[PDB]
Amino acid sequence: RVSSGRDLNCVPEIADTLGAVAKQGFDFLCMPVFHPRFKREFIQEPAKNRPGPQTRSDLLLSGRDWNTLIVGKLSPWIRPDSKVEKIRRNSEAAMLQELNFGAYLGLPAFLLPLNQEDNTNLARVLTNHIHTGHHSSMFWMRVPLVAPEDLRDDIIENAPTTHTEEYSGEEKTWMWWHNFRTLCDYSKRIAVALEIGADLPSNHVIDRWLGEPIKAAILPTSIFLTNKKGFPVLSKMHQRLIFRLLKLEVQFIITGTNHHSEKEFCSYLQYLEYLSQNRPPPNAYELFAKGYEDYLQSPLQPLMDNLESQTYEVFEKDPIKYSQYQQAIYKCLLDRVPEEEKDTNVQVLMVLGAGRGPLVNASLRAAKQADRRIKLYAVEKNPNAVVTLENWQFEEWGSQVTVVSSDMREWVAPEKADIIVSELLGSFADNELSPECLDGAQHFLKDDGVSIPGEYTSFLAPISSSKLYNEVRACREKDRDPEAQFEMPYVVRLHNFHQLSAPQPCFTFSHPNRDPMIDNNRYCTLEFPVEVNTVLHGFAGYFETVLYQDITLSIRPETHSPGMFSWFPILFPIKQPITVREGQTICVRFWRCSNSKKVWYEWAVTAPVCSAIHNPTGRSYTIGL
Numbered sequence: 274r275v276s277s278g279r280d281l282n283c284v285p286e287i288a289d290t291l292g293a294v295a296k297q298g299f300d301f302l303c304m305p306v307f308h309p310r311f312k313r314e315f316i317q318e319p320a321k322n323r324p325g326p327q328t329r330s331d332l333l334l335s336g337r338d339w340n341t342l343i344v345g346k347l348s349p350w351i352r353p354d355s356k357v358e359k360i361r362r363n364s365e366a367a368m369l370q371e372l373n374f375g376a377y378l379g380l381p382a383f384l385l386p387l388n389q390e391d392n393t394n395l396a397r398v399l400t401n402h403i404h405t406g407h408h409s410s411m412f413w414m415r416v417p418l419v420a421p422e423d424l425r426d427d428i429i430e431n432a433p434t435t436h437t438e439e440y441s442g443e444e445k446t447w448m449w450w451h452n453f454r455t456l457c458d459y460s461k462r463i464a465v466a467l468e469i470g471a472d473l474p475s476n477h478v479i480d481r482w483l484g485e486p487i488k489a490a491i492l493p494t495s496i497f498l499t500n501k502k503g504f505p506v507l508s509k510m511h512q513r514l515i516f517r518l519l520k521l522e523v524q525f526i527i528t529g530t531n532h533h534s535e536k537e538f539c540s541y542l543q544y545l546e547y548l549s550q551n552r553p554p555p556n557a558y559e560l561f562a563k564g565y566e567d568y569l570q571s572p573l574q575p576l577m578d579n580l581e582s583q584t585y586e587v588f589e590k591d592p593i594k595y596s597q598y599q600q601a602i603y604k605c606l607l608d609r610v611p612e613e614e615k616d617t618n619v620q621v622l623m624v625l626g627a628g629r630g631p632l633v634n635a636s637l638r639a640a641k642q643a644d645r646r647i648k649l650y651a652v653e654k655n656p657n658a659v660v661t662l663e664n665w666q667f668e669e670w671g672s673q674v675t676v677v678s679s680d681m682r683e684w685v686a687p688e689k690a691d692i693i694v695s696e697l698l699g700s701f702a703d704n705e706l707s708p709e710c711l712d713g714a715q716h717f718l719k720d721d722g723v724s725i726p727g728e729y730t731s732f733l734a735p736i737s738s739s740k741l742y743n744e745v746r747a748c749r750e751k752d753r754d755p756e757a758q759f760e761m762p763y764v765v766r767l768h769n770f771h772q773l774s775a776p777q778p779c780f781t782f783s784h785p786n787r788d789p790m791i792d793n794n795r796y797c798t799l800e801f802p803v804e805v806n807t808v809l810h811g812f813a814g815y816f817e818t819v820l821y822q823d824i825t826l827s828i829r830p831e832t833h834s835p836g837m838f839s840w841f842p843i844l845f846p847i848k849q850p851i852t853v854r855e856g857q858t859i860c861v862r863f864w865r866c867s868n869s870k871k872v873w874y875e876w877a878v879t880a881p882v883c884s885a886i887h888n889p890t891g892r893s894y895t896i897g898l
């Protein structure tokens with residue numbers, strides 16, 4: 274578990290080199306598919322008629338070896354962007370030739386350089402290849418952290434290096450890649466091979482690149498320092514970066530010659546191995562989530578839908594959610610039933626949305642550990658869950674628990690309740706319609722009763738991730754609006770991304786809802802100070818809830834209830850990405866709207882430039898009442 278290749282520019286025999294390279298521990302080889310010095314003429318006689326074979330035979334390796342072990346490289350003389358027409362045209366033919374040969378072989382990927390600012394024709398020609406025949410090579414755009422013009426040794430007397438800081442100029446290689454990928458229309462098949470140099474840049478520059486589709490990081494031998502035993506290693510600041518890329522499960526490519534010419538070469542790879550297993554193991558959240566990184570799912574809608582047995586099972590595999598709930602009913606029973614009243618006073622607890630019982634068992638445990646007495650109702654509308662309750666009630670609970678098979682908003686109640694406990698909370702707190710449901714059940718709370726939870730708040734934060742943007746773009750479907758996928762929330766363990774500003778509260782709800790003419794609709798404006806240049810792709814959503822007094826739950830990253838994996842964040846995309854300059858404010862507007870059938874969100878960017886209103890009138894996304 275750390276995937277690694279060798280870069281070479283020199284392969285006498287593809288047979289023997291591959292074997293040398295396997296023996297060193299490498300998983301794959303980046304090599305030329307034509308000789309990197311064999312320039313070719315397509316137009317002028319007599320060179321265009323150069324006889325003989327143009328490159329090596331495909332028969333030198335097994336189909337399987339081409340498809341797994343080999344990554345091809347563009348000849349370095351191919352310059353589709355030269356100022357010389359004649360080179361522009363040979364390079365055009367050269368590139369389609371190399372790209373088509375990579376295709377013939379079924380190479381899993383082919384490497385192309387971004388080594389200058391104008392790669393317009395290079396995009397045009399790659400974009401052309403991509404729309405010609407059926408193939409599916411990945412294209413690795415080799416792009417350095419630092420333009421080589423910006424790490425030249427300062428040794429031209431009449432051409433000094435820039436000794437001043439240019440915040441935006443030190444990011445130029447990100448704009449090289451941004452322009453390339455924008456021109457190629459964000460094709461899912463164009464990724465980054467990020468070249469790390471001897472000196473890192475400022476974190477601002479490295480940060481530009483998080484949220485970017487990084488498939489490979491290139492480590493030249495020449496950036497490794499030597500330790501006392503004589504063996505290659507990396508700076509502490511290079512380590513910080515490697516630890517971040519291993520989180521992006523990228524592939525590591527080792528380019529250049531052995532500069533540790535005492536200590537052998539698998540030494541370079543071994544050090545990567547040493548860093549892999551010398552990192553912190555996964556916490557419970559991370560072991561639960563490995564699989565889910567940047568996987569878009571539909572927000573659950575347990576009102577409009579009856580949930581599957583196996584969903585409830587994952588629900589109830591959260592020890593923190595439920596121990597936090599137990600502790601809150603504990604504290605509420607003590608504050609409601611003084612000691613000397615302990616047997617005179619039996620409190621009425623109504624679990625609203627009981628599912629398969631976990632809040633019942635959390636209510637039965639609390640009442641024990643406080644030594645008070647409770648009448649339980651278990652109100653649930655999903656009759657498949659009621660089969661689970663009515664069986665786990667005959668066999669186990671008593672009399673104590675009466676199962677009600679009803680929508681809480683419809684139920685006529687035998688008694689009023691001292692406490693109502695609910696678990697109707699979504700990733701965006703109110704997105705499963707806690708507010709509308711508990712509003713409808715509020716009439717059977719005693720004039721002085723408690724709701725657990727008592728309060729919840731959504732939070733929002735602008736993010737950049739060309740990765741997640743591309744993922745949302747791919748959810749186009751037959752037979753709906755071609756852009757609907759941008760007008761709906763996804764729940765997703767956001768991973769390859771950049772939070773551009775601190776979360777801020779969006780919508781808040783309190784239970785009970787004291788003040789009448791209730792209205793659960795809302796408009797909110799948020800101003801996000803942004804400190805970097807970037808690209809906005811959507812808004813991360815999180816929440817916090819007050820169950821009782823100081824007992825709370827959070828999926829707001831800065832206050833996240835540790836251990837608690839029930840909820841992943843939500844994501845609200847925007848149709849069109851929005852450039853943000855350092856110092857500019859991102860202004861977003863959220864509406865929560867409703868009729869009597871549906872609830873939905875609408876949303877807009879008003880600064881620095883306007884988006885369209887997303888999801889007007891729930892045309893793309895609604896939550897069923």
Ligand SMILES: Nc1nc2cc(CC[C@H]3C[C@@H](n4ccc5c(N)ncnc54)[C@H](O)[C@@H]3O)ccc2cc1Br
Nearest residue numbers: 575576588626628653654655680681696699839840
């Ligand atoms: N996003 C999440 N949402 C959760 C919701 C729940 C509660 C699901 C229950 C509530 C039931 N429900 C919903 C609306 C409703 C209603 N109006 N009357 C009765 N039962 C109702 C509904 O039928 C169902 O059995 C539990 C765990 C969750 C974990 C996550 Br992560």
